[PDB]
Subunit: 133 residues, 6 copies
């Protein structure tokens, strides 16, 4: 059908601020289903760097990796109609109220959640976190 | 400008237990219930009249089938700028913050209907609440 | 044991915009709506029949007055052990966790009524939904 | 980096019991309370100062009367980009997802005030918390 | 009528955990109204010790005062029918789900909220926090 | 002081979309996740081990079939007095305020499992997370 899969990361600030269920709940409410899920008490920097490889040239690259390994993260593969972009809109940004980041986050770095932004990004990110493909 | 508008709560809302969730969003925006009917299964005729403008579209029959595949609630809501405001509340499955934006992800199963103009509002209210 | 029970949503619920809140608590416990009527103002007779057992109590008339001071919704709910479970959901204004426990604080204005026995449930359903 | 901004919770929030709902939205966005005062009734000259840029408008007097019709809370919030972020949270009655977009439907009774610039922020904070 | 007033403290853990609105919301929802309210970025130990004077002989007395001045608190005077005990039940305890402490707290000391437990306690506590009687 | 306890989120939670709702209640009580696994379908021998004390009961096989009818999540939670506090959170279908009391109404489809003793806790954690 229009069925898709996408990769979401719940970031360490979410655990810090006790917002894990709140975030997963918003995705659950829009009728997306968990296909795979993995809890990392601390992610290997290796995985983080791969995941953010497209960002390796940026000023914020290392500070961001630092944060991403500063506490637990959950990686989830979601599935549903048009999953990649719909879950991207749910994530939104810190400027737009009504989205996850819009309602709950206020920082350029500590922003609670990652979602794949394209078909190619999803395929690649899912592979990084669930290599057992 | 105080108006009235017609809302339908669709069978997917009952299936997924989103009924009160949906009504609550409209209630919290301060719109009031003027009349309301619960249909365990809506008469197919009523659904056909309701969606008449669409009779030529390819989705007409499938949509009718779905609209009759479970209960629905028909509600007349009152309030300032009600037709326009409740339409925004309804929203669409793309933009978060709305009923459809937060809770739906289908082109057919989208939880709620709301009139979109003064004319369709008058018409739909007469279809579901002829007692006027 | 699958049962049906009668619920009234009282005028204070409309006044304080707690309608969907109340219905949502029953919906989330997995009870289903079997029938439902919205009354902009309930006929005083219906209210008198409904509260007959209380006709001799000092609060009878004041209570009737309140019950007619705004809209109410009459609902028939279905589900396993529905009469007993929805009574617990209704609760009382003392113990938190229930509808009254969380949302009410009056001996008269207490948001919701729920049948309390198999007999009163049958009776009340006939008062509000005679079509049987 | 850090900014501070002035928020007013308006009397319609108390009347409609939405005070915690509004404060909660700003809290969930990680803004912190620096100062706060509850006014069972705000002195009229504070209200008039606060809206002084509006002194020539037709709605001026009526809005002041409304603002003095019940309790208000004045809060200084602190956080990154506080002024603009809280402005967007307030939003407007046409924009679902925001405070006014979800809970308000009036030109005047719109639940919340938030400063809209650095200068207005600085000035408004000194009106409500002149002890600084 | 049956009208009463009672004193509530929102404790420093509430600000720490971002649960201030959540707590005040539960009281607001049961139809109690704020009569006076005061924000303390940090309360004078003097006030805390008075407030907990009946506890001056206990092992936990000083550790508790320590915590009560470890961050902001809000003191509120609420009003409504039977306010003292109804708001006491709302507060509940860490063992009873459905109450504030029952749903949200898990510690003998860091327990989010105080509510007066009698007519005499209320009168005295209100006097401590809003001396302007 | 600290304890750890085993929680199972049952297939009815996935079917009814209450997974976040349940995890949220335990999160709001300040319990932390130590370990967690999602099982699209749990191997039947894990389920049977997990319920082994129940092997002679009449409901044994049927309950196992239910537990394998959809996804489940196994979580190790850590916090002060975790075992007993999470047990009370789970509660039962007769007790409003708890997970089962608010959201469940069945003898078997009751949303959540939580360990009920130190020994059962230790044993159940080793069934679902034997890597320790
Ligand atoms: O100035 C920045 C920009 C981004 N990031 C982090 C947060 C962000 O989530 C991630 C990827 O950056 P992006 O693609 O700009 O944001 P998004 O995650 O919204 O795609 O890098 C920073 O730490 N600082
Ligand atoms: O391709 C489609 C388009 C629409 N519909 C249904 C869903 C929609 O709610 C109804 C009316 O369609 P619309 O007027 O395009 O949508 P709306 O209800 O958003 O005005 O028809 C379909 O089943 N398939
Ligand atoms: O002193 C009273 C007692 C009761 N009632 C009203 C509220 C109540 O909902 C209704 C029926 O009374 P009940 O059977 O004692 O309460 P419940 O509805 O909890 O069974 O009468 C009063 O107005 N005053
Ligand atoms: O026609 C109007 C316009 C505004 N106001 C009130 C409500 C508003 O909150 C306040 C200030 O007006 P504004 O700056 O236009 O609105 P905002 O508060 O969104 O900046 O004056 C009215 O009563 N009538
Ligand atoms: O062992 C204890 C007991 C109490 N307290 C603190 C928390 C409590 O809120 C306050 C007053 O004690 P209480 O009267 O036993 O509890 P409550 O506040 O529930 O009345 O003292 C502790 O720090 N440790
Ligand atoms: O008659 C029964 C009793 C129990 N069970 C299932 C549901 C229950 O969660 C599990 C274990 O039973 P229990 O220990 O009595 O319930 P709990 O999980 O509350 O300890 O077995 C049934 O299917 N039928
Ligand atoms: Mg990106
Ligand atoms: Mg249309
Ligand atoms: Mg009775
Ligand atoms: Mg302005
Ligand atoms: Mg005490
Ligand atoms: Mg057991």
């Amino acid at each position: 059908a229009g069925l898709q899969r996408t990769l979401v990361l719940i970031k360490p600030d979410a655990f810090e601020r006790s917002l894990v269920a709140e975030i997963m709940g918003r995705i659950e409410k829009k009728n997306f289903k968990i296909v795979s899920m993995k809890f990392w008490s601390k992610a290997p920097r290796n995985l983080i760097e791969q995941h953010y490889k497209e960002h390796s040239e940026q000023s914020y690259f290392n500070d961001n990796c630092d944060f991403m390994v500063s506490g637990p993260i959950i990686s989830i593969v979601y599935e549903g109609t048009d999953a990649i972009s719909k879950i991207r809109r749910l994530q939104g940004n810190i400027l737009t109220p009504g989205t996850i980041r819009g309602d709950l986050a206020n920082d350029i770095r500590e922003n609670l959640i990652h979602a794949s932004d394209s078909e190619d990004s999803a395929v690649d990110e899912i592979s990084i976190w669930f290599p057992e493909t």
